[PDB]
Symmetry: D2
Subunit: 390 residues, 4 copies
Amino acid sequence: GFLPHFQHFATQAIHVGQDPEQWTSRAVVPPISLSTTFKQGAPGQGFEYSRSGNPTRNCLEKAVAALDGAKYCLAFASGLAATVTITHLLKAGDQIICMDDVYGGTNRYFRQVASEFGLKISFVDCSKIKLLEAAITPETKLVWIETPTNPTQKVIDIEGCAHIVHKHGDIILVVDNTFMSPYFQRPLALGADISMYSATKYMNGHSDVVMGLVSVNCESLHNRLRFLQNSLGAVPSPIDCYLCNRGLKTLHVRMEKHFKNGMAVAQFLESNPWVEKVIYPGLPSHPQHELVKRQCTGCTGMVTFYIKGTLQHAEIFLKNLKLFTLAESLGGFESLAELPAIMTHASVLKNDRDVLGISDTLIRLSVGLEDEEDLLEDLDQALKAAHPPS
Amino acid sequence: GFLPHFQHFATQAIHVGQDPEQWTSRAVVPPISLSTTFKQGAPGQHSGFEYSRSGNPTRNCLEKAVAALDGAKYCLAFASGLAATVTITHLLKAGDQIICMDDVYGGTNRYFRQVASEFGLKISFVDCSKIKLLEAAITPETKLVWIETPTNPTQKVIDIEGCAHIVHKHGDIILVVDNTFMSPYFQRPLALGADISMYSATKYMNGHSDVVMGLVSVNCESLHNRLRFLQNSLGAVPSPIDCYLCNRGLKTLHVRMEKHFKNGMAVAQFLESNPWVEKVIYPGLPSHPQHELVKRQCTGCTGMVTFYIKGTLQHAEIFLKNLKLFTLAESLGGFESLAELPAIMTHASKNDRDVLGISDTLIRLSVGLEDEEDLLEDLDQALKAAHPPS
Amino acid sequence: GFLPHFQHFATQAIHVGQDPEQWTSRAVVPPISLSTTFKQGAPGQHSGFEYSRSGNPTRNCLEKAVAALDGAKYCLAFASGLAATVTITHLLKAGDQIICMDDVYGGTNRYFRQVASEFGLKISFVDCSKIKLLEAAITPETKLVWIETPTNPTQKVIDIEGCAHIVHKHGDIILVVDNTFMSPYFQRPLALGADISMYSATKYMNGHSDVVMGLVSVNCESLHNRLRFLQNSLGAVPSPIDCYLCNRGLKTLHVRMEKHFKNGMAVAQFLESNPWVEKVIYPGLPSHPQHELVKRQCTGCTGMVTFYIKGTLQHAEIFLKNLKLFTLAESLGGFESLAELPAIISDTLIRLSVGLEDEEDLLEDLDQALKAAHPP
Amino acid sequence: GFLPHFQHFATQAIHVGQDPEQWTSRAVVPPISLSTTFKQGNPTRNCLEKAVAALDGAKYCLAFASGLAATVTITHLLKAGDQIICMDDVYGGTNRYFRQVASEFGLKISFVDCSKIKLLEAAITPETKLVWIETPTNPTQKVIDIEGCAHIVHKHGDIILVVDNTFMSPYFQRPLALGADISMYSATKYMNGHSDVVMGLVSVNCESLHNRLRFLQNSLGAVPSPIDCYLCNRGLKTLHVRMEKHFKNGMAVAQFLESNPWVEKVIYPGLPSHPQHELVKRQCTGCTGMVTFYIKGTLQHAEIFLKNLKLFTLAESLGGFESLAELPAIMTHASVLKNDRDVLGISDTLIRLSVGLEDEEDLLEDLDQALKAAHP
Ligand SMILES: *Cc1c(COP(=O)(O)O)cnc(C)c1O
Ligand SMILES: *Cc1c(COP(=O)(O)O)cnc(C)c1O
Ligand SMILES: *Cc1c(COP(=O)(O)O)cnc(C)c1O
């Protein structure tokens, strides 16, 4: 019942930005151009300064656009740099509405930093249309959403938000598509103005690159954003560019497997007597399940659950994992487990967390590409060991 | 007559941050750790790294080395020099004023003028070369003073110690010195009263024209924490490979900067004696207006030589076109010599630039590490091809 | 009905050698250690790293992972597949004979015939496609037997286990199997009785077409020790960064190989359907003359498809020249699809290295190229 | 009084092979080209070879995965039944390869004191095909008359002279200028200078020799990683400033040690007390940071001395930016037979320094304090 997979996705992942006719070599894999300057044929003149920038950032960028079905893509030092740059599209007096449940670092940036520079920040859910409709003002100029949301995996109707945000006039809708990747979801096809990623996660997928990507269609938006790319200089390294472009080549066969494993894990957890509740859009227990099948071609490896009992039971459970690793980050090849309230989302004010449901009993799992059976044995084994009140 | 060289510079460039006891292998050169996360013994720890962005072994060594070379207690690395500036100005709030030196690098000019001002920051450009003008320009709302010495490209020299006294006399206002041209080998703005010593590492620090990078050295405790927080929240972070590479560059900073100074001196002297040259602006020359100041605040000079060819734009252009060794290009500080025409190239971002004396006639040389005789022979030939009215 | 997929492969591909308890930082992904020397506590202490040659953290993790993936005790990493072949042969001495396969990779061929022979090693070549032929060739001086399966490009399959009994009956001889074109996901020569399981990692292991790297997996204690000595003393050694990149690529070997197989199968069945294709050679087809051996010996197949087009060389060229998705290039085992005319093994033989692009597209491109060759 | 510096060295280290017109980007620093496939050697290696060629005053250069793999490729020029003559004090590894590996494949190995030209001339056999020289030698710093050797070896036909120039680098010594046939480097040392690349370099002029080498570089497959090539080429850009600071620092350290009453004897080419000092000046533009000496007393004193170094590091390599110390008889030259070392002067009491680029005052202080501690 899912949206049928995007035609040509793998072919494009492999071949776009990657044409051999580009180099004197004819090489299949693009060379890494570390250099910061370029010889000019005459003063008023190709490439001129690496930060503006360069061959390897450009290849990555043509490829990510393609996969997003976009005309343009822009690459940054990190997902937060992408965010901070995106917010620089605005001015003092502007308002930003932000999905109430959102990456820790995003919350922090909007609440404690952008609010210092004449920007009004409102937190809204935004998974409920009429609340968003209410919060919009003549001052509103950016609407930032995430779906599913990190860590609670609330799911927003993107085309729904798109239609309503664009009725009001000149308002930019950004969708942070970190969790799903353009393999499973194309915010731009659903009417978003920007589709943004922390490429640190699934896009690169190999836990060895920190990076941001922003994809766009609108001509004037692209130009304004390109300016900010050069002017803020929050730019990724050419080597980082390369590694990430290398990671994309397997995005499709990585996301499929995250899908299989994720799904199995969420099914196993939901049948387990020691688990209170499982949130995973791929399950029919998910309140937005039907929506998910309309917006997405599948699901990812992110499974969040509440363990029965207290933080002490959550801790014993984490401490007994022998294959999942207790760490921050996600979307890598390796399975990771996490206690958002005290780790990844510690920078979200305690009251904000509790309204959100980020309790001491919430675990976020990032299901990796290991054997299903082993991920399953490890979870069984750890939950047995915690044995909370049933 | 220069300040004596800083005592343990060469030793510190090679050892600080670099202790083998840090690694289980006892490696003499720090490993490149690309890893995006790290395993945690327990949820919510004090100890160890947690997330690369915040963050990491290879960046942290580099930061430790640079701090030492700046004579500072802390350093922070960033994706670019520009991002280092953006982060620094995020230190402030709406209603605050920044005062900026007048001939400043084109990019810092643009960000302050065209981006920072749209967020309730008042930007004033002041010829801080005339100390009393700075004292006059200071208002209750003044939070940051941004200074560059020598200035790129006209190379006015600012009395850091004199500015520092004035900027510190009343209120709580920060003095940044962009020390990109000098490197901490030739000038220590912190020793002279600046609150922050900032680098575009892309230039001399790295020296090999293959890393874009920024650096902020700082002593003050609460200013550091305020910076550290922004480094993490805005995420304009550098790649670990770039960190590795830049730290690798630093190992020869002393031997490179000595050669830039020898070669730089010889080129300047040669230009001053040449009938086709109108004026040579070079700190190491008796003819530079702030020459004696240069000797009180610096242990030496750099490979940045600027002069005005006699005649017209056509003459500048022809001279540039005839260079066979010097390359026509936009960066600086590398191992190879670069020639540039600020008006139409690096400083394209007109009025203010006529006032500053960035005319058609003006040429910026970045003298590199090639053989002096060859450098001289290249200039000669090229000046001869243009043969301006003498 | 292939061999069951080897248990825990994906899990070991991802975790063996990657234990974060190795690094003071507990990094989840091993640091790249470029360091050439290591501080020593006292002169000639027994312990730890001393010289990168020799070797080093990053190389060491890769060796541990590959060994696990081959189901071997040990592995040694080399600057390339040829360099591995050379180190392996430095295992011998003047007066020894090596026996090599008939249809062996051009590289190992060139080195044996043109270089190794010059130093008192008899090389003599043999069709191992038939086991009694290998019997006959064995000599009181036979010290090494070099096999490669499936062969490239005619794709003949060699009964590995069969050759192992024949060869091991005569003392003291090493069986090397070049597993470059299967990868340990699909074939484990050591579990089959080979003494050595050799790779050119340049191909499928790394699969990203941006590393040259050889790999030797071994079980036997003395043979490992001998090999390690040649690793350090001849110095045909991998850069730590290549080590890293190949380890990075390993992390997706399982999902990459399933897709190569899936796509290769689809291409093979498409060609076997097409009236303009004389003949398809692909081990996953019931039409392949060693198909049964394949299912007893492998867990599946690869993206390598060979075919003969109807007509002549002209028709082969028109096809190759009209490919829009498949690239004309001389390599294989990467994520991209490559086509090649291996003679320029008759006028008419075409080799495909089928990649990870969309099935529909690969099929449409072939179909369109065959039509250009043979109109309407 | 040394040979005058080579004109254009710096200019050429920075620009040769570095021409921006080679790339569509017009990049000032050459890309790192990682590919192993090409749409119908690699650019990053090629740039490095050209630069080293220029620095050596050579027509050609070949890059290898280590200096050890360069030595092996070279020996592969010969056939069984031929003879190698090697300098009697070589790098432990060169000694090991010749004595323990090469000798197993029909080659005859002979060691000779070539610092005594009379002895080399007597040693030459109708089937000598290669003479292998290191100067100054590692670690006893014995110096050979390259030119005098060259004339002696070329007097009767088809013998190759290799000069291992690792210690000097082409900034201080150009063996090819002096009549050598091959100028060989472990680039792992001074050439890269940054302690993070393992590599070998071979420079040659002779046309037939190069084609032979080029053949072997391809067939043996001990090629370096393109990334490593990038990194070494990057190191080269500071060769002249590095080698000049090594010279000052080395010199100051030799002087200090020679004046220190706890030091029995110092061996350093830049000192008048070196028996070949005068030769060093006719043959070289300067000296390096390699300073070897004998501490007064027994093994205990050497050991206590090493334990108290606080700036120099106890490690097993050389020629990098960091100051290094080792005790050859126990570390770096354990692979040379005990009886070999005694004859060679590698005793319990010989310490080899690699002086780096730290401030001179600190290095002298660290040695002062270490010697005081060993001898109160
Ligand atoms: C981690 C994350 C980010 C920020 O990306 P970085 O590269 O870590 O700065 C943004 N959005 C989401 C949903 C994330 O999970
Ligand atoms: C180039 C430069 C900067 C910032 O440049 P980046 O290219 O973003 O590293 C800052 N100050 C000076 C003097 C510069 O030349
Ligand atoms: C170390 C060394 C070698 C061997 O080179 P590697 O890069 O260690 O394989 C050869 N010659 C000399 C003089 C050396 O010091």
